[PDB]
């Protein structure tokens, strides 16, 4: 019924890697199938990331187009959980106008190491019974007051300080409001009006949804866990009151002196037990986009004790490294390719190509006959896997238009005639050679 | 552009009071509280429009605001019913003749009732939430006002802000 902001997309079916407790890959589990060799290796590097001991480890995932390179990266990103930072970048995204390439990579690294801070404070939480504010007839401005708070079990009176009274009066709290006061911070917050007293009221100053009175003890403790990247700690400290740059992205080329100072202070917090450092992962997809200046930065940037684990993926043969003349493996220079472990991936068979389609129809809510799967699997080897996957929704829609309730083989033959594969498109582009532009 | 092509449709009530102010009548209790000289329980404000007139009864704390704004009888004003704040619009057009020149623009008498309510459906892209959070407005501070005298420029919105907006629109 209801549609949320996240929907069905290209990799929505993957929910882990499907390894057992002995770190062996199951044939089909957690929405991944086949590809046993690379899934084992992904298990080992995931285990290394969770241990957290060793910095700057790098892994490259390689293989043909359309063989689950990105899928395995998403697989481990699910398995690693939400509580541990995992950053995705496509290699194109570092070519900023606001800052240099080495800055952009430094930010992407520092955004991938978390500092985790548990915080507890004491709060008072109650329904406001009354407020008194007394103001001088001329005087210096030394206002004074009293406030009373209620729960279903208890009520009491507070004599109010001069720094605190400005907060109540700023946020215009009044009797009948339910509020939560943080004693240490001196900040008020409001839940809403209690149901009872709004009957005994003037012409309206507010019109909003009510809330129930709090229960039991009037004073209680609260706990929050904050995860803050090293990057946002660098930004906060780059200038006074710089907070908006965490959303705005306006902070350019941060001073090295600031980061050096933060790296020290983070270590002190670790030893003090005030904060936990938690290494995460940086995933650069399509990494062959980087210039050789970017590669040369990675060589030596990867050698710091604050470096995260780095994962890269690519689909490239021996090709010329972007921004130079030189050919090399994966289009990466050997300086960097020597510093990492390569995992490689394998083309699919009938047996697993059919199984991928089966697990995809389960996610898009489709039924098909075994005859239809048989035809579609052939299409998915005559032509690429992504194309076969793309026919499944089109087949379901054409089925539904004609008031069917299960996709039949003639639905698939219909769709297959209507939307082209690249190979067929490129073939028709030969017979109209003069009519298209710039051949 | 990928965030421009996704919309929200969100719907909310507006309520407002408006009219020419005919009276301000601070109302005393029969006796003051102990030791005090006088005590005021409420203010009465009488508002009129092309449809009619009525008294509104208000909390005494309104009176400070009604002298921060230079409200005087024969002005037209409005009150935002969800917030309690009051704003002056100007002298009513009725009085435009009382001098050969005055340095104020007169405004016509409100039409319809003293108290108004409607439901409206407002529609916005996620890109509009991105920008409105990345460069705030309604400044009463050096950061805002400096930021608003300076030439505006687009900026590389961070993936954190996109994250947080996604979290709250889901709620």
């Amino acid at each position: 019924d209801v549609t949320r902001i996240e929907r069905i997309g290209a990799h929505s079916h993957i929910r882990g890697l499907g390894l057992d407790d002995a770190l062996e890959p199951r044939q089909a589990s957690q929405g991944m199938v086949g590809q046993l060799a690379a899934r084992r290796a992904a298990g080992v590097v995931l285990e290394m990331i969770r241990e957290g001991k060793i910095a700057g480890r790098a892994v490259l995932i390689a293989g043909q187009p359309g063989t689950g390179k990105t899928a395995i990266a998403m697989g481990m990103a699910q398995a690693l959980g939400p509580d541990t930072p995992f950053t995705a970048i496509a290699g194109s995204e570092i070519f900023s106008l606001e800052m240099s390439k080495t800055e952009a990579l430094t930010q992407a690294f520092r955004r991938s190491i978390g500092v985790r801070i548990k915080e507890e404070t004491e709060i008072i939480e109650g329904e406001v019974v009354e407020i008194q504010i007394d103001r001088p007839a001329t005087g210096t401005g030394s206002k004074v007051g009293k406030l009373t708070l209620k729960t279903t079990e208890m009520e009491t009176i507070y004599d109010l300080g001069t720094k605190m009274i400005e907060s109540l009066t700023k946020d215009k709290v009044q009797a009948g409001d339910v509020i939560t006061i943080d004693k240490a911070t001196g900040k008020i917050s409001k839940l809403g009006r209690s149901f009872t007293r709004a009957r005994d009221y003037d012409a309206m100053g507010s019109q909003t949804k009510f809330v129930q009175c709090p229960d039991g003890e009037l004073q209680k403790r609260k706990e929050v866990v904050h995860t803050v990247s090293l990057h946002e700690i660098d930004v906060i400290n780059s200038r006074t009151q710089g907070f908006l740059a965490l959303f705005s992205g306006d902070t350019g080329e941060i001073k090295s002196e600031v980061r050096e100072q933060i790296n020290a202070k983070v270590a002190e917090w670790r030893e003090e037990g005030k904060a936990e450092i938690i290494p995460g992962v940086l995933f650069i997809d399509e990494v062959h986009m980087l210039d050789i200046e970017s590669f040369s930065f990675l060589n030596r940037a990867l050698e710091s004790d604050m470096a995260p684990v780095l994962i890269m993926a690519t689909n490239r043969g021996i090709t010329r490294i972007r921004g130079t003349s030189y050919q090399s493996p994966h289009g990466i220079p050997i300086d960097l390719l020597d510093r990492l472990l390569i995992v490689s991936t394998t083309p699919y068979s009938e047996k697993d190509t059919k199984q991928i389609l089966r697990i995809r129809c389960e996610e898009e809510d489709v039924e098909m006959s075994e005859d239809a799967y048989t035809v579609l699997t052939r299409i998915g080897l005559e032509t690429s896997l992504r194309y076969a996957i793309q026919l499944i929704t089109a087949a379901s829609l054409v089925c539904r238009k004609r008031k069917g309730t299960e996709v039949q083989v003639d639905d698939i033959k219909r769709v297959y005639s209507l939307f082209l594969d690249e190979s067929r498109s490129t073939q028709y582009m030969k017979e109209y050679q003069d009519a298209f532009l710039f051949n | 552009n990928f965030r421009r092509a996704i919309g929200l449709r969100i719907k909310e009530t507006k309520e407002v009071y408006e009219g020419e102010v005919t009276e301000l009548t601070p109302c005393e209790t029969e006796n003051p509280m102990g030791g005090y000289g006088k005590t005021i329980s409420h203010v009465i404000i009488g508002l009129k429009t092309a449809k009619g007139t009525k008294q509104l009864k208000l909390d005494p704390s309104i009176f400070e605001s009604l002298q921060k704004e230079r409200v005087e009888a024969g002005d037209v004003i409005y009150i935002e019913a969800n917030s309690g704040a009051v704003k002056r619009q100007g002298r009513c057009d009725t009085y435009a003749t009382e001098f050969d020149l005055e340095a104020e623009e007169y405004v016509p008498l409100p039409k319809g009732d003293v108290h108004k309510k409607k439901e409206i459906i407002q529609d916005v892209t996620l890109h509009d939430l991105d920008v409105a959070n990345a460069r705030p407005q309604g400044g009463q501070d050096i950061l805002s006002m400096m930021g608003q005298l300076m030439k505006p420029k687009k900026t590389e919105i961070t993936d954190k802000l996109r994250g947080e907006i996604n979290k709250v629109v889901n709620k």
Partner: peptide, 27 residues
């Protein structure tokens, strides 16, 4: 001597001690 503002279940109240102007003149 202090001007005093009160809000409670019985409704709101503003109060002035005797001899203070209590400057809420009518209009």
């Amino acid at each position: 001597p202090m001007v005093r503002y009160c809000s409670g279940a019985q409704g709101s109240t503003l109060s002035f001690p005797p001899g203070v102007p209590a400057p809420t003149a009518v209009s």
